[PDB]
Amino acid sequence: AYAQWVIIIIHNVGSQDVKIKNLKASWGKLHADGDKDAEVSASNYEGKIVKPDEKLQINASGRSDAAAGTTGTFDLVDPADGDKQVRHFYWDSPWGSKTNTWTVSGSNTKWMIEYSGQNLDSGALGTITVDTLKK
Amino acid sequence: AYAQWVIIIIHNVGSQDVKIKNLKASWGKLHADGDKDAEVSASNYEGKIVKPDEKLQINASGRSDAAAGTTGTFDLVDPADGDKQVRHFYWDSPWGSKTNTWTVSGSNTKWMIEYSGQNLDSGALGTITVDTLKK
Amino acid sequence: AYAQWVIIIIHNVGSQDVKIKNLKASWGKLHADGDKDAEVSASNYEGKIVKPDEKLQINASGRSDAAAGTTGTFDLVDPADGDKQVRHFYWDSPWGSKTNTWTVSGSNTKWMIEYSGQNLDSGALGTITVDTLKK
Amino acid sequence: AYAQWVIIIIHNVGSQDVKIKNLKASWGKLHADGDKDAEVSASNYEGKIVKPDEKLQINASGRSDAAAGTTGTFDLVDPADGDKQVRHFYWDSPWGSKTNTWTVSGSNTKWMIEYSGQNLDSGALGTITVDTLKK
Amino acid sequence: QAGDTLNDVIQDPTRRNKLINDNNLLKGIIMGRDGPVPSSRELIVRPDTLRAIINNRATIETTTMEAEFTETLMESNYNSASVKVSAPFITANSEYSESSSFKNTETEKSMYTSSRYLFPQGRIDFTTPDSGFDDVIKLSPQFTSGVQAALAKATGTEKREALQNLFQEYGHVFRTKVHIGGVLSAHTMETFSRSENETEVKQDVKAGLEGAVKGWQGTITTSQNRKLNVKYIVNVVQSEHWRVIEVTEVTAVADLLPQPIRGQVKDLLKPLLGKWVDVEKVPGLESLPVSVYRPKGAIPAGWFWLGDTADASKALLVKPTLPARSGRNPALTSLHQGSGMTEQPFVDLPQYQYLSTYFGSFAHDTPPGSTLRGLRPDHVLPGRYEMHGDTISTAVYVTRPVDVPFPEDECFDLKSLVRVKLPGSGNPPKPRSALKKSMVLFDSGE
Amino acid sequence: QAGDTLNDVIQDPTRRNKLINDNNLLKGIIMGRDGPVPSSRELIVRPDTLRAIINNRATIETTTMEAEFTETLMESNYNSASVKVSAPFITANSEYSESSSFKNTETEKSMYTSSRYLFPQGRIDFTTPDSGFDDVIKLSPQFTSGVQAALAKATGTEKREALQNLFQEYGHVFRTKVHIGGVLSAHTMETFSRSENETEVKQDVKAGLEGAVKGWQGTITTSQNRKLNVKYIVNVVQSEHWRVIEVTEVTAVADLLPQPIRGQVKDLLKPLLGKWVDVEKVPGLESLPVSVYRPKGAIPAGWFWLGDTADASKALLVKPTLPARSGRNPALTSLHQGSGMTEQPFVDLPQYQYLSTYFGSFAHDTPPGSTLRGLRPDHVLPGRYEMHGDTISTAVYVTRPVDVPFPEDECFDLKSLVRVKLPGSGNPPKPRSALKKSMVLFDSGE
Ligand SMILES: CCCCCCCC/C=C\CCCCCCCC(=O)N[C@@H](COP(=O)(O)OCC[N+](C)(C)C)[C@H](O)/C=C/CCCCCCCCCCCCC
Ligand SMILES: CCCCCCCC/C=C\CCCCCCCC(=O)N[C@@H](COP(=O)(O)OCC[N+](C)(C)C)[C@H](O)/C=C/CCCCCCCCCCCCC
């Protein structure tokens, strides 16, 4: 159901590029900014580069009246250093549970990753802003 | 209900202070960061000064299991010239309607306001970040 | 149960000592290397110093036939900086849940921390090697 | 099941190449790093060279809800010296037994092979790091 | 006739003088807005003979250059050393544009490639005063008189204007080793991300360009499907038609002067006068991990500062040595407030750079922002960051010079502060540069 | 006219002098940044005759070379002995970069191959002083006067600078055996794994290149599907067009000087001054199977050490003999801390090397790491490891010189220590080198 949604804004505040990979929405759909009806494909972001000082918005939502919610994962990798993984993100705004999940895992001492805005107590997962900076 | 929630992050990106005034939630309650049970009063923000480069977070949500959303308003004013009105903000995340409202009104050319992250299609109103500058 | 287990190897790849503090296993038990039946106390590791090029192994697992996994926390601390907190580690290999948690938090720019080997998808949390370097 | 898993990290710490051969998962499957649902083919590793100071990760797991563990073998051979055998590795994280097996066999006097991290008492076989060095 | 070499030409006074005159061998090269062009005035006295070697090995030679304003130098077949010697003058006198195709960002790289199909005849050498040999070149008395007249002016500004005119007439460099013969040249520029393997890109471009010149098509496609625009230059067609096909050494015209005059001229050519002053901590900004310092007190009239620094001891003030004149690139540029959701300065003149992010609200109409200036691109070199702070929102870079063994490339250690994450949007590019020490004259008494 | 050989040319004084002049036979070759090029100044006195033999057998000859910086020497058709004699100078004066395609790791090997389609006319020989014959070449009085002036200076640094200038002007080697005629050369470089059979790879590349020169295409495909980039040089057009097509012997210019002056010049050309000091055991490191030793006490100003060693007796300190100057490769390089997860030094200048891993935390701003230096690539030769320790984590290599029968290739037995398995990640490549004894001057009193 559209009531279960998440917006992930990857904002590259560093000076070197960061690439997205393995963007997979297990549940729900990816859609366009401000229009849950205008569904889009994961290919729109796969292997995309977020250049320094550039923002990239990913919108995910549950399907209409679907009683399913949304859930997905994606990796941030370093285009330099042979696509070495920077972080792995998993998000889940479930329809059947009052607890949302937003977990960032992985270790890469060459990158600083901060995130904020997520809601976990109840309702949608909210708008999550992620700032990435390669040291 | 807790499914109707909003987070408003007022972020001062300028060099002049901005003040919050007349913060009133007509529906729902204000609560602490990440804890919808720890209700707080409008006095915790009324007249508070957001220094340049600082963030102030206001969390609102409906009453638990209440079949009611969260509706409220507040004003950004300029303390440097006698608390002149910078903007008027109104938010509505209703329980009984699919459309959320986030309205910024008023005008004074000395200030620039850019907000992002709001969700209006369905569900919660989401996390809204408001950047304010005096120019 | 013994099926829920974790091995944490702290390996000082630097040139200055590091200390372990507040090692607490809230669920399960600490045991000897390769022997889950030989329990040990957190005192065996509390305040211990990991010298450069040295490895320290902490083995945790659930109680035998217990339907209860293992869960715990500890802190890496700088003994040459007034026992300043370096990092906070939390692990959970639960019995009734299919997701394992391995969280490293805190901030100390004088130290770099890498870790690998964790398994979060299913089964035991696995053998995690943590490399610490004070730069 | 996914509860039976193994991670084998081959780390070439010497100055000469080492080649993987005869890799075969008699049971279970090989998958990508941190994602047990992304099955991978054994050909992705067969005949691959682990250059000095390089790490190669092989992830094996039982099939989901399969009631069968994971098992396999492979060989490390010297790309110089006509693919002479360096070692033969056999791993087994069974579903129906509490005992895991990890055996390294073979004689090659001009190679030092060390391994650590295996768990044999119960649960998954764990993360096994293998260091190889041609004298 | 057939079988003649450079030796036969040099032994004949008529043919030797024709070779000297048709190749402008007695003239300096003016590294100006139109590229390296010979001066119309003779810089040295005509020699009685030339030192030469014979070489007839025809072949294709490829070179690459990574400096920004060296396109025309590459088109003239200068080698790496000559390009390095000539780059400062070209950069100072070049025409800057914000729409240049050359990119030198921290994630993207650009390079010029040149392939020369050479039919050589030999090489000619000139003896500079620095070498102790007795066949040194002699500066023409007209040039020496011009230098003396320039240095005899009453005021420093008059002397500097006279020297600028003199070097615009006689040139900035003199070619000391030149190659004679014929050459077909092909030139191109390529931009690629720094994540790619540089060696493979260079090899692919080299293969494409060498194939283009060998078969000699204004556009070429390489093995990696790289779309290259190629500029072709013909310098082929008998000793009457031999021309300069390559420059393997150039000496700055100032370096040919006697030492007591050489030092004075080099000092007078420095674009800026420097001065150290006391600093003062910027009020507020307690959230930042370091203290921010600005020049203390009022800036003396006519002097300018270069930005906020982490140095608590002293700050550098600079003053232009040459007045502003049309057709001449100023040493310093003014800054203007940004357009929206930013309080940071922007350089007025394209391709100029400032060193620090502004910690506050920049206003170009009031102090201390009215005396903050950017720098001409020839004044600065890339620095190195060192980060301070535990979080992105509070982290700040301090820029330090890149250590070099040769003092010629040393840069000031001003410890300029660059905020890691500027609030808002539409901010300028982040400075990552340091000021060259050779551009600033200290203790000049002016 | 038809049927004329080198004998007819040498008999006629006009034709003999044309042959001498057009081929720069009286001039040395400067092994510099641009490759082997002849000097413009005559090194020897013009002879009254030339010793020559006749040879008219046209054929294709292929050669290979495994040295790193010998590409341009191979392109000039130097044989193995000439390349060996000239390699030190080319290596010292070469332009280094980290993007070079040449690879010499322990698993990969690179080699240059050259195929010459030769149309010879004969060979010309010059008698060196060491031969003992009575028709020796005579050094030009200008060169002898230059050497005397260089050696007459006051301070050692002045003498070394004068000698550097003199050899940059006159050249480093003199060709004493040259082949005359015409040639068409094709040159390529191939990199391959050491696990492959070298004979098969060499035969494949040779067949491809010989097919290329025969029947004369910038890229060639061999039978083994190897893609080779080929550079073609044309030196063939009558006796007036005969050129030098191959060099069979070169003698270092310093070797032409009389012995009392030759020894002094050779000593003054050594890049480093050497000294022996006492050592102290590094504290800690009880895990390692050997004791680590470092120079004891403060290092005298201007002197540097080369790394940790297992020698408990003495350590070697080195001081550069030539001041740093732009356009010249320093004998030593500074080291900087690694980027991340490593506390090991990295060479500042590309292609330089240090001899030991740092057993501790390396800081270039504080001692003893402030005086630790790397070496120019011409200073070192590969060594051999001796392993100590029963486990990978505690094993250490001691580097020992590779025994050679000739003193010219002896290396110091410093017993440099290398950590077999460095903790962390991002470590630099393991050192394996040893320092040549010929680069270090002892007991100079400076
Ligand atoms: C007389 C007794 C007879 C009994 C008759 C019973 C017949 C019905 C049986 C089976 C339902 C048909 C299969 C549905 C599979 C579910 C997959 C899914 O729920 N699909 C979501 C898509 O969600 P999404 O795209 O986000 O991804 C999902 C995640 N996944 C990884 C899987 C893709 C999508 O919206 C949701 C659709 C579900 C609608 C089902 C309606 C139920 C019908 C009730 C009948 C009431 C009895 C009447 C008797 C009087
Ligand atoms: C006696 C007989 C009684 C009969 C009672 C039956 C009434 C229930 C029927 C239907 C309600 C549901 C409305 C759905 C409309 C919106 C379309 C839509 O939601 N479809 C996909 C979303 O697709 P998507 O998200 O990609 O885009 C969506 C937007 N877009 C415009 C772009 C398509 C999405 O999975 C589909 C979700 C619907 C699954 C629920 C099906 C319930 C069927 C239970 C049968 C019970 C029988 C009982 C007998 C006693």
Ligand SMILES: CCCCCCCC/C=C\CCCCCCCC(=O)N[C@@H](COP(=O)(O)OCC[N+](C)(C)C)[C@H](O)/C=C/CCCCCCCCCCCCC
């Ligand atoms: C005696 C026989 C009686 C038989 C009774 C059996 C009936 C089965 C009951 C169960 C069905 C329910 C399935 C759940 C799917 C809902 C999907 C969803 O979650 N629905 C949200 C909307 O989600 P959405 O955001 O997509 O809205 C649309 C957004 N859009 C932009 C498209 C407009 C919307 O709030 C949520 C609605 C909650 C469902 C209310 C059900 C009331 C049941 C009354 C039973 C009274 C029987 C008593 C008679 C005596």
Ligand SMILES: CCCCCCCC/C=C\CCCCCCCC(=O)N[C@@H](COP(=O)(O)OCC[N+](C)(C)C)[C@H](O)/C=C/CCCCCCCCCCCCC
């Ligand atoms: C008249 C006789 C009829 C008999 C009944 C037969 C009709 C068909 C019944 C059932 C099959 C169809 C199920 C629908 C699955 C939807 C897809 C899904 O799967 N919905 C999950 C989504 O989970 P989530 O929202 O958390 O998404 C994140 C998932 N994640 C993995 C990340 C956690 C989430 O549980 C939602 C589950 C609620 C569904 C309950 C429906 C009740 C069924 C009626 C009972 C009353 C019978 C009355 C008889 C008199």
Ligand SMILES: CCCCCCCC/C=C\CCCCCCCC(=O)N[C@@H](COP(=O)(O)OCC[N+](C)(C)C)[C@H](O)/C=C/CCCCCCCCCCCCC
């Ligand atoms: C026959 C006599 C029977 C008379 C009974 C009359 C039943 C009343 C009817 C209708 C009530 C309308 C919803 C009450 C307001 C809900 C508040 C809320 O929004 N409810 C959410 C959760 O709210 P919340 O997240 O805030 O929980 C608190 C957060 N906390 C973390 C603390 C848990 C919760 O999930 C989601 C609820 C979706 C609506 C469900 C509708 C199903 C009702 C079918 C009744 C059929 C009876 C048939 C009899 C024959």
Ligand SMILES: CCCCCCCC/C=C\CCCCCCCC(=O)N[C@@H](COP(=O)(O)OCC[N+](C)(C)C)[C@H](O)/C=C/CCCCCCCCCCCCC
């Ligand atoms: C035989 C005995 C029969 C007994 C029948 C008695 C049932 C009535 C009970 C009590 C009244 C309940 C209304 C109070 C509203 C609360 C305030 C409000 O107002 N609730 C709005 C919130 O609106 P919203 O949140 O969207 O906006 C807020 C801000 N804004 C400015 C925009 C408005 C929201 O929609 C309105 C929701 C409607 C409630 C649905 C549940 C009723 C279930 C009936 C069950 C009957 C079973 C018995 C049948 C035999």
Ligand SMILES: CCCCCCCC/C=C\CCCCCCCC(=O)N[C@@H](COP(=O)(O)OCC[N+](C)(C)C)[C@H](O)/C=C/CCCCCCCCCCCCC
């Ligand atoms: C008449 C009514 C029926 C009576 C029977 C019901 C009583 C309850 C039965 C059994 C509870 C089981 C506890 C939960 C597991 C304990 C925790 C654990 O995790 N158990 C692991 C242990 O493995 P462990 O690693 O800890 O070994 C430790 C080290 N050691 C050396 C010993 C190996 C072991 O694998 C895993 C076992 C799971 C098996 C589930 C069995 C389901 C029971 C079906 C009942 C069907 C009744 C049918 C009536 C019609």
Ligand SMILES: CCCCCCCC/C=C\CCCCCCCC(=O)N[C@@H](COP(=O)(O)OCC[N+](C)(C)C)[C@H](O)/C=C/CCCCCCCCCCCCC
């Ligand atoms: C006449 C028949 C009477 C039968 C009634 C008897 C029922 C027994 C009473 C209640 C069980 C009391 C639990 C005590 C242990 C709780 C410790 C714990 O806590 N168990 C959690 C472990 O959680 P976890 O591993 O994740 O902890 C990690 C830490 N963390 C904080 C992160 C969570 C885990 O989920 C939950 C496990 C529950 C096991 C289920 C066993 C079912 C037995 C079926 C027998 C039925 C027979 C039927 C015949 C007709």
Ligand SMILES: CCCCCCCC/C=C\CCCCCCCC(=O)N[C@@H](COP(=O)(O)OCC[N+](C)(C)C)[C@H](O)/C=C/CCCCCCCCCCCCC
């Ligand atoms: C007339 C009676 C007929 C009925 C009798 C049948 C009884 C069955 C007895 C024996 C089954 C043989 C083991 C089932 C295969 C195991 C597959 C597996 O291994 N099951 C794991 C899965 O773990 P997995 O990691 O693979 O999860 C997947 C990964 N994913 C990420 C997607 C979650 C899961 O946890 C843990 C499973 C524990 C065992 C579950 C069964 C115990 C309940 C017994 C009920 C007894 C009732 C008796 C009635 C009289």
Ligand SMILES: CCCCCCCC/C=C\CCCCCCCC(=O)N[C@@H](COP(=O)(O)OCC[N+](C)(C)C)[C@H](O)/C=C/CCCCCCCCCCCCC
């Ligand atoms: C009165 C009712 C009586 C009913 C008749 C009973 C007969 C059916 C029972 C069981 C026998 C069949 C064993 C399974 C052989 C497959 C071996 C295998 O393959 N199992 C995994 C392992 O996969 P894996 O990749 O690891 O294999 C590695 C490769 N290797 C070759 C080495 C195996 C692989 O996922 C596949 C798993 C499927 C398991 C079968 C689950 C269905 C259970 C029966 C359902 C029908 C019951 C009907 C009741 C009314």
Ligand SMILES: CCCCCCCC/C=C\CCCCCCCC(=O)N[C@@H](COP(=O)(O)OCC[N+](C)(C)C)[C@H](O)/C=C/CCCCCCCCCCCCC
């Ligand atoms: C009234 C009677 C009640 C009937 C209930 C019986 C239970 C059936 C439903 C619930 C379990 C079925 C889901 C579990 C499989 C997960 C899907 C999958 O996938 N199983 C593959 C995994 O293989 P793999 O890991 O490689 O792929 C995974 C990755 N992927 C991308 C594909 C998701 C691989 O075959 C493994 C298969 C073996 C599963 C064994 C389950 C026991 C079945 C006993 C049937 C007995 C009949 C009884 C009738 C009286």
Ligand SMILES: CCCCCCCC/C=C\CCCCCCCC(=O)N[C@@H](COP(=O)(O)OCC[N+](C)(C)C)[C@H](O)/C=C/CCCCCCCCCCCCC
């Ligand atoms: C009236 C109905 C009666 C039904 C009876 C007929 C159908 C069911 C019987 C036949 C089971 C068919 C298993 C298929 C295995 C295929 C995979 C495998 O074969 N799994 C092995 C290997 O996997 P493993 O990983 O452990 O070994 C590692 C590899 N290595 C080579 C090294 C060993 C390992 O034994 C695992 C064995 C566990 C099997 C579970 C059996 C419990 C279910 C019976 C409960 C009966 C309840 C019904 C009563 C009413």
